[PDB]
Write an enzyme that holds these catalytic residues in place. Structure first.
Site, PDB file in Angstrom:
ATOM      1  N   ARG A 168      42.181   6.696 -48.003  1.00 19.85           N
ATOM      2  CA  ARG A 168      43.295   7.303 -48.733  1.00 19.85           C
ATOM      3  C   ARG A 168      44.664   6.621 -48.696  1.00 19.85           C
ATOM      4  NH1 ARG A 168      43.438  10.578 -44.215  1.00 19.85           N
ATOM      5  NH2 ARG A 168      41.343  11.249 -44.896  1.00 19.85           N
ATOM      6  N   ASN A 190      46.188  12.060 -43.340  1.00 20.99           N
ATOM      7  CA  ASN A 190      47.484  11.385 -43.343  1.00 20.99           C
ATOM      8  C   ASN A 190      47.412  10.163 -44.231  1.00 20.99           C
ATOM      9  OD1 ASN A 190      47.835   8.636 -41.721  1.00 20.99           O
ATOM     10  ND2 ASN A 190      46.218   9.788 -40.661  1.00 20.99           N
ATOM     11  N   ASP A 218      35.424  18.035 -36.382  1.00 19.56           N
ATOM     12  CA  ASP A 218      36.492  17.113 -36.007  1.00 19.56           C
ATOM     13  C   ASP A 218      37.644  17.971 -35.473  1.00 19.56           C
ATOM     14  OD1 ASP A 218      38.365  15.008 -35.856  1.00 19.56           O
ATOM     15  OD2 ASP A 218      38.958  15.203 -37.995  1.00 19.56           O
ATOM     16  N   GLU A 260      46.083  12.208 -32.978  1.00 16.51           N
ATOM     17  CA  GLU A 260      45.142  11.309 -33.640  1.00 16.51           C
ATOM     18  C   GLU A 260      45.049  11.506 -35.149  1.00 16.51           C
ATOM     19  OE1 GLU A 260      41.773  12.235 -34.986  1.00 16.51           O
ATOM     20  OE2 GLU A 260      42.009  10.265 -35.919  1.00 16.51           O
ATOM     21  N   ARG A 301      30.506   4.418 -29.857  1.00 18.12           N
ATOM     22  CA  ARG A 301      30.560   5.833 -30.201  1.00 18.12           C
ATOM     23  C   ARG A 301      29.121   6.293 -30.476  1.00 18.12           C
ATOM     24  NH1 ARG A 301      32.230   6.342 -36.236  1.00 18.12           N
ATOM     25  NH2 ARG A 301      34.241   7.078 -35.388  1.00 18.12           N
ATOM     26  N   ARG A 316      27.103   9.870 -32.494  1.00 19.58           N
ATOM     27  CA  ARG A 316      27.078  11.201 -33.095  1.00 19.58           C
ATOM     28  C   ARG A 316      25.657  11.502 -33.508  1.00 19.58           C
ATOM     29  NH1 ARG A 316      31.843  10.620 -37.655  1.00 19.58           N
ATOM     30  NH2 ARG A 316      33.643  10.791 -36.237  1.00 19.58           N
ATOM     31  N   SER A 345      33.835 -27.420 -45.060  1.00 19.80           N
ATOM     32  CA  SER A 345      32.651 -27.390 -44.199  1.00 19.80           C
ATOM     33  C   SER A 345      32.523 -26.117 -43.375  1.00 19.80           C
ATOM     34  CB  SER A 345      32.651 -28.590 -43.250  1.00 19.80           C
ATOM     35  OG  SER A 345      31.548 -28.527 -42.358  1.00 19.80           O
ATOM     36  N   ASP A 351      32.969 -10.109 -13.996  1.00 24.93           N
ATOM     37  CA  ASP A 351      34.179 -10.326 -14.772  1.00 24.93           C
ATOM     38  C   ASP A 351      33.880 -11.175 -15.989  1.00 24.93           C
ATOM     39  OD1 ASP A 351      35.797  -8.765 -13.193  1.00 24.93           O
ATOM     40  OD2 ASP A 351      36.496 -10.427 -11.931  1.00 24.93           O
ATOM     41  N   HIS A 370      40.732  -8.783 -33.286  1.00 23.06           N
ATOM     42  CA  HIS A 370      39.367  -9.154 -32.953  1.00 23.06           C
ATOM     43  C   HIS A 370      38.714 -10.055 -33.983  1.00 23.06           C
ATOM     44  CE1 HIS A 370      35.503  -7.850 -30.689  1.00 23.06           C
ATOM     45  NE2 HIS A 370      35.351  -9.043 -31.239  1.00 23.06           N
ATOM     46  N   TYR A 422      36.286  -0.642 -46.058  1.00 22.02           N
ATOM     47  CA  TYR A 422      34.986   0.004 -45.899  1.00 22.02           C
ATOM     48  C   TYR A 422      33.841  -0.957 -46.224  1.00 22.02           C
ATOM     49  CZ  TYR A 422      31.179   3.425 -46.354  1.00 22.02           C
ATOM     50  OH  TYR A 422      29.988   4.102 -46.207  1.00 22.02           O
TER      51      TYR A 422
HETATM   52 ZN    ZN Z   1      38.600  12.850 -35.545  1.00 23.22          ZN
HETATM   53 ZN    ZN Z   2      39.948  13.210 -38.447  1.00 25.47          ZN
END
Ligand code: ZN
Ligand code: ZN
Ligand SMILES: *[C@@H]1O[C@H](CO)[C@@H](O[C@@H]2O[C@H](CO)[C@@H](O)[C@H](O)[C@H]2NC(C)=O)[C@H](O)[C@H]1NC(C)=O
Ligand SMILES: *[C@@H]1O[C@H](CO)[C@@H](O[C@@H]2O[C@H](CO)[C@@H](O)[C@H](O)[C@H]2NC(C)=O)[C@H](O)[C@H]1NC(C)=O
Ligand SMILES: *[C@@H]1O[C@H](CO)[C@@H](O[C@@H]2O[C@H](CO)[C@@H](O)[C@H](O)[C@H]2NC(C)=O)[C@H](O)[C@H]1NC(C)=O
Ligand SMILES: *[C@@H]1O[C@H](CO)[C@@H](O[C@@H]2O[C@H](CO)[C@@H](O)[C@H](O)[C@H]2NC(C)=O)[C@H](O)[C@H]1NC(C)=O
Ligand SMILES: *[C@@H]1O[C@H](CO)[C@@H](O[C@@H]2O[C@H](CO)[C@@H](O)[C@H](O)[C@H]2NC(C)=O)[C@H](O)[C@H]1NC(C)=O
Ligand SMILES: *[C@@H]1O[C@H](CO)[C@@H](O[C@@H]2O[C@H](CO)[C@@H](O)[C@H](O)[C@H]2NC(C)=O)[C@H](O)[C@H]1NC(C)=O
Ligand SMILES: *[C@@H]1O[C@H](CO)[C@@H](O[C@H]2O[C@H](CO)[C@@H](O)[C@H](O)[C@H]2NC(C)=O)[C@H](O)[C@H]1NC(C)=O
Ligand SMILES: *[C@@H]1O[C@H](CO)[C@@H](O[C@H]2O[C@H](CO)[C@@H](O)[C@H](O)[C@H]2NC(C)=O)[C@H](O)[C@H]1NC(C)=O
Ligand SMILES: *[C@H]1O[C@H](CO)[C@@H](O[C@H]2O[C@H](CO)[C@@H](O)[C@H](O)[C@H]2NC(C)=O)[C@H](O)[C@H]1NC(C)=O
Ligand SMILES: *[C@H]1O[C@H](CO)[C@@H](O[C@H]2O[C@H](CO)[C@@H](O)[C@H](O)[C@H]2NC(C)=O)[C@H](O)[C@H]1NC(C)=O
Ligand code: NAG
Ligand code: NAG
Ligand code: NAG
Ligand code: NAG
Ligand code: ZN
Ligand code: ZN
Lengths: 695, 695
Positions: free
Chosen positions: B155, B202, B332, B369, B479, B481, B573, B611, B634, B645
């Site tokens: 969004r 948001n 959520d 969050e 994660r 779910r 290359s 380590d 990263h 996405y």
């Molecule tokens: Zn969430």
């Molecule tokens: Zn959320």
């Protein structure tokens, strides 16, 4: 076997011997011979005992003059050119009559060009002030060759600050006023600077760091170079070095106007006039620079010796210094490379008897350092990931002398106690101190202010190969030389700095004949490396960083209080920083206390403890680096955005406050200060929490 | 006592119980009640057994609507306003009739304003294409309210991409076409989306990360905020959320022109016309947005539980998820916070019996969050220095469900074997799998492509609190779910995403009645945390990063080979990258081999070894971050500059190549690609050398 065994094995007749083997031939970085010596030190180190030893090489943007169409300056008139052409070289010093490859004095990385124009003298180039003082006499340097004298700000700016004025080219000369020790002869039988002697040096402005083309990343074979146009800090107008007999002839016919203060006089056989062009019989007269130098991607080599640790092989203690010189490298850097060389030979001698350091020791012979610390840097850009997580401490080793008047040390507050303690148990070579501790010698001759009960230890920052490891990675480090009396001689470096006359004999016959001093520095340096890479709990003492931080805060705080009104006007507090400092001190206290009570029997604890220490130095590195300079990340110590030599700590705040008076937008002006105070504080605090109980 | 003991103690009747205690009241971040629950979880965790547990708080820029002058949209004509005013709230779901504090649907951080203008429908806002397709029909959206449907790009861009078109405001609605499961009712007795249901969210564009005002630094009490004007990614034009019964009325009178492809139809009781304004009896008709929301610096709280390690207390394993919800947080995030909650209670149960993890475990209940991951981030901005050097792994825990059709895992290739091995020794709750391994269940229902002999593990990147730890700090993480069938339902999230109807009953009565699934995820999650924070040698397996990297290179390589000609034209290359990858694979091989032969008796070695593993993940972080986004560092995994996405790995290269065809300056165009290939390669190589023999 033991610390002693190590030191005692360091002989002077060797370091002397070595210095000689390194001085006879020109080792300009990238040259077909600098490579031969690389190979030599490589071979030689394997023989002394190192486990691993190889060459690390990168293709770096270097730069040399055209042997065929030599560089020089001169004076022109009514179509007449020949009117006084500059020296095409430096009168070869004594024994070095017929020696091929000596490279003609030249400012490195200067752009090609043959500009014509009047001159405008400038006290040591724009110390900012000096050029910020050409408004006090209508002077648009635009399209005018500015000639300035080495000294104060690092030459780079001299050239850049020169571009911001409009300069068409730059003549930089070595003026006697600054560095010409009162009461000495000209090299041959001198020790001082000859009139024909010129001081080389590079004019790159790599503020942060790196090869001007590989920023952040190594100059490896598959790299992607930037491209001259979009390079990093290349000058935009030609630059060339002059000797004073030669500078005189230019400043001689100099027909300017009212030379501001009484400081703009460089004690030469001529009046220091600023104003444009020449006067009298000399009016059509104008100086012309002839620079035909090319920038080339050159292969450079770094020798990297390795002595595997016995217990903590994943923890690194580095001893390194450059080998690449400007001509022979009497002092810079050979005077140091030999010390290193002996130090390795000794550790090697020790490894062969069946001994190894607790931690691993790495020895490096950096390359291209005179061209922008290129060597050391690019190797670090490459190994950040390891130094970042394994770097314990880094000890730099360039020149070993500058005087006879005592020891000089620069280092992260962490290594103070180490330097102190070590130096106390070391024999002082100084004259008049028979059987006196080096510490005793050192203290008495230069008492550390505030608490004169001890030696003066200065800060690191900006300069030699350690730059990367310290101000970018955050690896505790230090250096140590032998210098002159800080009051008899007030100037910067030693006369004959980056000159030809920097030769073996110059040292052996004027600086350290018996080589006492070289041997000492060698024990000093050795010890550091030794202790660091072998003492159970690291030789660091966080409490000292506390002590210094306060001082730092106070000093910076008082700089801000130079505007008590504007401070309250825009609500500019300092409690935060001072707070942070407080806790640091309190937090360090307990950590130190906690450091003695733990049973050194249990490793993991020891280690956990040790890492707290090791990583503390790193704790002061702000990833985002300083404003508009990302390769300077040490919140505490780091080149000041503005005056790099006359700068302080908490550069962020300093630069923020620097010349705030004449800041156009009074509001944002303090927002910035009000901001760095914040970051500085945050950092100090965070740096502290590090020493706070894990978990 | 032992892994089992831990798992076996995880009861479903508790997580169910918990979910209920967390769902009854609105916990919008910053609200007087989100704070009460903070205090609750704080207290409750101390009781379960945690050693330390405190609140971490920061003053963050949040934003809420004006309770007095409510927000809404509407239609205007010949001075007539009242013509259809939007919903002023969402029809309160069942039992929650009289419940104070439910906050009216609203796009967060939207600018104030009451703009008047015609509308211009847009397939899921500028997926880039969609707005890059208004030239195919003369359309200057400038000064026109663009209405778009949630879906595809996140969004934020929808709104931003909307600004680049000229938008005067933005109407974002939840269209059935995308998320409205074929064959289900509307929440109450639904499970699907009610017409009045609106999806909050948001619209900040913190590309990198942070509170829009404290970038790089914590929103601590003494911080220096930026200032709305110069904030980070705030929209520049008003935005508001619509339910479809309500979107229809707007799209209804919609009188535009030829709706491009057949995809621009959102299956509503109306024709999807793009073109400006309305037609027919509706010509003077125009929509007006009424937004009176304010952005406020609000105090937010993070609960941070601590379970001191027994051996490596300086090494951290983190289990964290947000608690701040949008209304009740059926799924959520409460659906996850309870799992965490049970997990702590269990470890706590275990600590009390006299046991501790080898490494330290940290539990966090992030705040803010939903407002830009603010909570988690700012706490990390603050503790970078420790996570940086002590972060082992971070396991995120937001929603725990989305379906009944199997397990979902996302994680750094390092944790694959761990997930694999763990899941195999876990009971599968799935229906029709009595006494079958969760692994068995999981594999069969969603076979990992290429080597279907195992479960599909997707990549992390962009989204939940883990963003900071993973894409900015470089801390291995994952994660897990329970999701839907990837083929029966092709859409994004679950219907009722950020809606009111996200309520307790919604879960208990439609998703996980017996709470099998919640208990499972809980064992899954628990195990990860457990193993990580307790298994002698870390549960990582570098070899996997090798395997994936290749694939990545190939995929990206073939993207470039979509221009075989232009490649040879500009000498582009890929040997370097492919090379690097090669060695990584070869280097990892030996490290792994070397990992089994060492005597696990000697700690320091173990540690040194460990380590290498721990820091490998960090090895992939490029300090300079990605182009024009410094908080995404990263090199391998990271939001694509363009399509976040539908993006790939080696974002640098990807973005470089993305739409290169129409790149104005064909030369620099490939210079950039030719460049990222370089960095990517360098990184991979350097990342590898890490695993290479220390010293
Ligand atoms: Zn969430
Ligand atoms: Zn959320
Ligand atoms: C050193 O300077 C000479 C100048 O004579 C350079 O020669 C240029 O290039 C070729 C000869 O190599 C000639 O055709 C040009 O007319 C010369 N132009 C210039 C610069 O005057 C020579 O290339 C330089 N050194 C090298 C080989 O790099
Ligand atoms: C090295 O130290 C010697 C002292 O042992 C210096 O010799 C004196 O130098 C000063 C100049 O600073 C002269 O005025 C004296 O006449 C010299 N002898 C005396 C009385 O000490 C020597 O100049 C120093 N040179 C360096 C710095 O290497
Ligand atoms: C430097 O030496 C001093 C004393 O020789 C060390 O400080 C003492 O250390 C001993 C044991 O390490 C303690 O019992 C004393 O209480 C300490 N006294 C002081 C003066 O603090 C100091 O730790 C040494 N520093 C290093 C690491 O070399
Ligand atoms: C919520 O909206 C009202 C609008 O009535 C805001 O009131 C403004 O400020 C004061 C009253 O607080 C009045 O004198 C102004 O005329 C109002 N102007 C506006 C925006 O219409 C009120 O401030 C807002 N909520 C708060 C207190 O922040
Ligand atoms: C949860 O799983 C159950 C199956 O146990 C789902 O029930 C089926 O849902 C589909 C729609 O996808 C219907 O067509 C079937 O009639 C339902 N029963 C059958 C035959 O399985 C339920 O919808 C799922 N709901 C979620 C995702 O929580
Ligand atoms: C996952 O489990 C497999 C086998 O259960 C582990 O791989 C074997 O590990 C043993 C000892 O660790 C070795 O002797 C075998 O040679 C390994 N075989 C295979 C299949 O490679 C694997 O290490 C486990 N991974 C983790 C860390 O959980
Ligand atoms: C510096 O010392 C070394 C060894 O003491 C010299 O070694 C080289 O030159 C020797 C002749 O004097 C050869 O016999 C050696 O094989 C050769 N080995 C090396 C180190 O390459 C070296 O030449 C000396 N440098 C000079 C010329 O002063
Ligand atoms: C969630 O559960 C806790 C504890 O099981 C509840 O605890 C609070 O409310 C109790 C009354 O039911 C008081 O007796 C406790 O002292 C009080 N303690 C806490 C945790 O603050 C909590 O109210 C429950 N939440 C709700 C209202 O559903
Ligand atoms: C020093 O004497 C030598 C020999 O007489 C001069 O060197 C000339 O011959 C060398 C081959 O042995 C060449 O390498 C030199 O380039 C060449 N020098 C000339 C004339 O250019 C050398 O010039 C004398 N020293 C100087 C430069 O005056
Ligand atoms: C649900 O019923 C209550 C009580 O009849 C309504 O709440 C009113 O009184 C509360 C104090 O107990 C206040 O907090 C509310 O603001 C007030 N509501 C009004 C009239 O604005 C409540 O409105 C009813 N639910 C709704 C919003 O329809
Ligand atoms: C510059 O070199 C000499 C130096 O005096 C001068 O005589 C000569 O005329 C100049 N170069 C030429 C030949 O143009
Ligand atoms: C420690 O110093 C910090 C400075 O950031 C201060 O804010 C804090 O209050 C101090 N610690 C305590 C005991 O609160
Ligand atoms: C908007 O609210 C209602 C919605 O139909 C409308 O009747 C009213 O006229 C509008 N607001 C006013 C009173 O101007
Ligand atoms: C390892 O891969 C690198 C890629 O950067 C390659 O340049 C190098 O040659 C390889 N190592 C060896 C054996 O040279
Ligand atoms: Zn040097
Ligand atoms: Zn130098």
């Amino acid at each position: 076997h033991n610390m002693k065994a190590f030191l005692d094995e360091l002989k002077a007749e060797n370091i002397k011997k070595f210095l000689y083997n390194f001085t006879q031939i020109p080792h300009l970085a990238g040259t077909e011979q600098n490579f031969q010596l690389a190979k030599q030190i490589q071979s030689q180190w394997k023989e002394f005992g190192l486990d691993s030893v190889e060459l690390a090489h990168y293709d770096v943007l270097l730069s040399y003059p055209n042997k065929t169409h030599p560089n020089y300056i001169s004076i022109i008139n009514e179509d007449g050119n020949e009117i006084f052409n500059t020296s095409l070289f430096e009168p070869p010093p004594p024994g070095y009559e017929n020696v091929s490859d000596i490279v003609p004095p030249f400012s490195a990385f200067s752009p090609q060009g043959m500009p014509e124009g009047d001159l405008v003298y400038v006290n040591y180039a724009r110390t900012e002030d000096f050029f910020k003082l050409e408004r006090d006499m209508k002077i648009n340097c635009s399209g005018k060759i500015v000639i300035a004298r080495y000294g104060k700000v690092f030459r780079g700016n001299k050239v850049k600050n020169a571009q911001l004025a409009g300069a068409k080219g730059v003549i930089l000369y070595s003026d006697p006023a600054d560095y010409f020790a009162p009461g000495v002869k000209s090299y041959p039988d001198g020790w001082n600077l000859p009139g024909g002697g010129v001081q080389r040096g590079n004019i790159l402005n790599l503020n942060g760091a790196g090869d001007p083309l590989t920023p952040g990343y190594p100059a490896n074979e598959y790299a992607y170079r930037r491209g001259i146009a979009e390079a990093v800090g290349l000058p935009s107008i030609p630059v060339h070095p002059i000797g004073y007999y030669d500078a005189q002839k230019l400043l001689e016919k100099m027909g300017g106007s009212a030379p501001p203060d009484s400081s703009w006089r460089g004690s030469l056989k001529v009046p220091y006039n600023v104003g444009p062009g020449f006067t009298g019989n000399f009016s059509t007269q104008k100086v012309k620079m002839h620079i035909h130098s090319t920038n080339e991607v050159t292969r450079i080599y770094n020798v990297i010796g390795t002595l595997r640790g016995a217990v903590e092989p994943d923890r690194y203690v580095i001893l390194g210094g450059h080998r690449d010189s400007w001509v022979f490298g009497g002092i810079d850097p050979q005077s140091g490379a030999a010390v290193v060389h002996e130090i390795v030979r000794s550790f090697g001698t020790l490894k062969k008897e069946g001994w190894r350091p607790r931690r691993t020791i790495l020895f490096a012979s950096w390359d291209a350092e005179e061209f922008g610390l290129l060597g050391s840097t690019e190797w670090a850009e490459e190994n950040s990931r390891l130094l970042q997580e394994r770097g314990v401490a880094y000890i730099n080793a360039d020149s070993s002398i500058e005087g006879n008047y005592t020891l000089r040390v620069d280092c992260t507050p962490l290594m103070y106690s180490l330097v102190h303690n070590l130096t106390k148990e070391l024999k002082s070579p100084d004259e008049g101190f028979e059987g006196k501790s080096l510490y005793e010698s050192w203290t008495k001759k230069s008492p550390s202010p505030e608490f004169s009960g001890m030696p003066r230890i200065s800060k690191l920052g900006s300069g030699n190969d350690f730059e990367v490891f310290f101000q970018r990675l955050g690896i505790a480090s230090g250096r140590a030389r032998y210098t002159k009396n800080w009051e008899t001689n007030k100037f910067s470096g030693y006369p004959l700095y980056h000159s030809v006359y920097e030769t073996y004999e110059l040292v052996e016959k004027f600086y350290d004949p018996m080589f006492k001093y070289h041997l000492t520095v060698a024990q000093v340096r050795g010890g550091m490396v030794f202790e660091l890479a072998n003492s159970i709990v690291l030789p660091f003492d966080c409490r000292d960083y506390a002590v210094v931080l306060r001082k730092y805060a106070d000093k910076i705080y008082s700089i801000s209080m130079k505007h008590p009104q504007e401070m309250k006007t825009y609500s500019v507090s300092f409690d935060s920083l001072f707070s942070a400092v407080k806790n640091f001190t309190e937090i360090a206290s307990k950590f130190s206390e906690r450091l003695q009570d733990f049973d050194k029997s249990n490793p993991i604890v020891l280690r956990m403890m040790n890492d707290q220490l090791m990583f503390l130095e790193r704790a002061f590195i702000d990833p985002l680096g300083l404003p508009d300079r990302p390769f300077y990340r040490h919140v505490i110590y780091a080149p000041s955005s503005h005056n790099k030599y006359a700068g302080e700590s908490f550069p962020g705040i300093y630069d923020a406050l620097f010349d705030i008076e004449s800041k156009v937008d009074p509001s944002k002006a303090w927002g910035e200060v009000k901001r760095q105070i914040y970051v500085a504080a945050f950092t100090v605090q965070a740096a502290a929490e590090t020493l706070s109980e894990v978990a």
